[PDB]
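README, section 4: Worked example with a bound small molecule

Sections 1 through 3 covered apo chains. Here we extend the same pipeline to holo records, where the ligand is supplied as SMILES alongside the sequence. The molecule in this example is zinc ion. Nothing else about the input changes; the structure line simply encodes the ligand pose together with the chain.
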Amino acid sequence: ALETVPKDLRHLRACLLCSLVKTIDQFEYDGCDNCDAYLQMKGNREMVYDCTSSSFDGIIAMMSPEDSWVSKWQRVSNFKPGVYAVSVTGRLPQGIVRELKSRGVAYKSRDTAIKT
Amino acid sequence: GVKLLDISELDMVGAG
Amino acid sequence: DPNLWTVKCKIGEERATAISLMRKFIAYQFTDTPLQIKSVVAPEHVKGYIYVEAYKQTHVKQAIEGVGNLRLGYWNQQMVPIKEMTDVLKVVKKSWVRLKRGIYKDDIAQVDYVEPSQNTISLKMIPRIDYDRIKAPPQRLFDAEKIRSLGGDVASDGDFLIFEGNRYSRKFLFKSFAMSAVITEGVKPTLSELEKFREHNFQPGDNVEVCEGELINLQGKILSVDGNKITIMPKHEDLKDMLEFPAQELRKYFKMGDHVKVIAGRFEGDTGLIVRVEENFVILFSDLTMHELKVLPRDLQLCSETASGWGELVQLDPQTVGVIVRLERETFQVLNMYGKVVTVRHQVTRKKDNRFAVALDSEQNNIHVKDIVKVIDGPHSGREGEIRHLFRSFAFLHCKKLVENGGMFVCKTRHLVLADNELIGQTVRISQGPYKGYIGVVKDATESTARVELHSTCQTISVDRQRLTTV
Amino acid sequence: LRRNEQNGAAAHVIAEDVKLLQFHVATMVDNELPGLPRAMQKSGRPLK
Amino acid sequence: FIQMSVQRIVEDAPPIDLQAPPRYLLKFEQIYLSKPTHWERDGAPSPMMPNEARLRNLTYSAPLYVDITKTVIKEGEEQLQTQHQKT
Amino acid sequence: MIYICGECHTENEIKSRDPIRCRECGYRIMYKKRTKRLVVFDAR
Amino acid sequence: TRETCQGMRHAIYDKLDDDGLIAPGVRVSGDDVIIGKTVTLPTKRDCSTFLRTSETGIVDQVMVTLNQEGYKFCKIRVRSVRIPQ
Amino acid sequence: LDLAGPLLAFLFRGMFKNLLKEVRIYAQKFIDRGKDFNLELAIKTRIISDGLKYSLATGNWGDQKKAHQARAGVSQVLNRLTFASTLSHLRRLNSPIG
RNA sequence: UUUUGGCAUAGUUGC
Ligand SMILES: [Zn+2]
Ligand SMILES: [Zn+2]
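The generated complex, written as structure tokens:
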């Protein structure tokens, strides 16, 4: 829905799990529109700062991931439509990753970059 | 036809 | 699968176009005019155009209709080739940063204090300002007295200062800026910036040996070069085949008695000849001087050009001339008539040299410039030098053997031995001769005659000055 | 183009930049071509 | 040209309508010309004799005006018609 | 120096840094006064 | 003057007045100056207007006015008698 | 024989179409933004004034960017040497090569 | 005490 789309260009941040790009206001007010149940950054700014990225390159307006080879290359086919980031700089702390793994969610890095 | 205007009917909008 | 088609877009407004087209898709997904395209891609670093996913070009044209931003791609579209579809999404990648926007674009800035709020960081900078004197620029130190004197928006707390748009400074600007407004990776400032706040160099033609391996002790001339793993192509002695060596296996070895230049270090720029090749202490002597210069093997290159090692006449003041004896970054080392070497700024005046000037030596022999003259009296008695500049009673002598002031010194000339007419533009009146009666203006004047443009007729003619009488 | 190689940029964009460079050098040596039209100077004259 | 062709060209031009929704209609109805007038640095109008224009490197030209009728339809069964005269 | 207004013949002096204007007409064309230098003519 | 303009052309300049213009009624050759005008270097240098260097004449009428922008500009009509020859 | 009438009518048609395009785009900007444009700021008078002034200033006739194939040689400096010369230049008619 | 300086298409005119 439109609630996922960012409202302005200022303070755009990409999530560290699903690469979802949103404003800091939308992370504060809605959390993650894909996996907030697994992260729970709604109602906490520090959780957003720990769980989102200040450095990203590339943006995809994923409209129909069910029939998108873009989502096949980026591994976002099973997620909802929205604004995703291609490459994300950042990493969750070990505590959040271990908590996700105990719930059966292994943390795959969205840093798909060619570092030199 | 095209009407004519006297110079007094030209408001001072060109200066504003 | 569907194919991607390129659509030209307004520069810098691709993401807004994608947002608008997604909103259009949602606003017409249930109507009788559905958008049959599948997706829209507006890459971050690809500026000027976007991609649309569809099975047909007609779908693209009918979908982008009503979008002004894509009108330059409306008539025709180009499909992305099938083999390059991966490359659309292929993405690559107390410290110092560089501010992006403002007048401090791409200026080195030292990260003084990092705010934990993750909104801005305090940065130390050098001001590129005119101190409110020109506006109604290069880096220079922050002068507090000047901006206090000039007034304007300025607030003083000793060394602490606020000025000109809430710019904060102390002793050097100290202002907060967003990390998104700077670059926090890949600055790598130089030594000069540190004062303000391995390497491989193989060249074609240079000779290198082999320090290890089965091909040890093979000296050959470099042909090519690369970054790290050079895989070099050296022409060895008594070998017509070309072998392979990386950068790490070679060393800049040179036989004695050959031209050598220094690539870097305290001895950079000086040329010369190496004498003895020890293990790592390579000793050489310059073309200028005869001092021992010890360099590493890597600090040598084979270059056959002559050493550079200039000598312009400048005016220290209207009473004393000066001869430049060394050229520096921001000053001139100038040797004057008195024999006193001084250091002066770039902004002395260039005097008109008189190369035909005549001077007398100590034996009443006329001497001119470029003449080899011996100094028999004075502080420099016994030396012999070539004249380069002249004064009323001084002469500047160059000598290559003398290593002082580039060989330039000065001695008094008597201690050496050789080894506009006022009538111009004046209204005049012909008081004598056939042209009597008339009035004219003097164009040119001489000792005897003078040209007059005649006012009366459309000509100019010359007349004796005796024939003229001024108005 | 050099930055694009140092960027490892896409092949088609590099090829189109090469096409543009081909046209520009061909226009420099000859702005009377039989192929692409004449290059202007954003003033309204073909270049000498 | 002045008395007929300018006016008839303006009539022959089609009306302009725009969509954001706010619908619009722009209409040009009548044309007006004054005599050749001249504005100094202060923007003060004055009659311009042709000798003054020949001397001062001006252009012996008269201003042109057209009354513009803008009828905006906000799709609420309303047509706000505003006329701007001597534009 | 001295200039003559081109309409009402108002003699007036104008500085080197003020735009020209007739001091009693407002007119904006000025003509230089005749030279005060000696001028002579042969009648040929 | 040479003392204020550090780049100049060799010619007379006393015909002009303090406004940098020549008074009408002055008999002038082709190499003279009719408009004393100079630009400030970023002292100053001359870009003054000379006569076409093939003739002589009399500066007949000098008019001074403002251009369309309002900048002070001047036209100078130069008379030259022509006898049949 | 197109005199000043059809001549200026043709150029006025071109410049009026250009001004219509300009006001269309300028109104579209604010109308898509969601407020009423200033109609006084919608018009840019330099299409017609500076356009006709250009086309008489240089003799080129047609759009300024279309000078490659735009026919020129219509407006000429008036021949002021004799009264008869001025009259002959006033009544002159040119046939293009075509 | 030494002077400088444009390229262009278009237009008209002269054996
Ligand atoms: Zn997320
Ligand atoms: Zn007056």
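What to look for in the output: Chains C and B do not touch (no CB pair under 8 Å). Residues 352, 420 of chain C lie near RNA strand I (CB under 10 Å from a C1').

Section 5 describes how to batch many such records.
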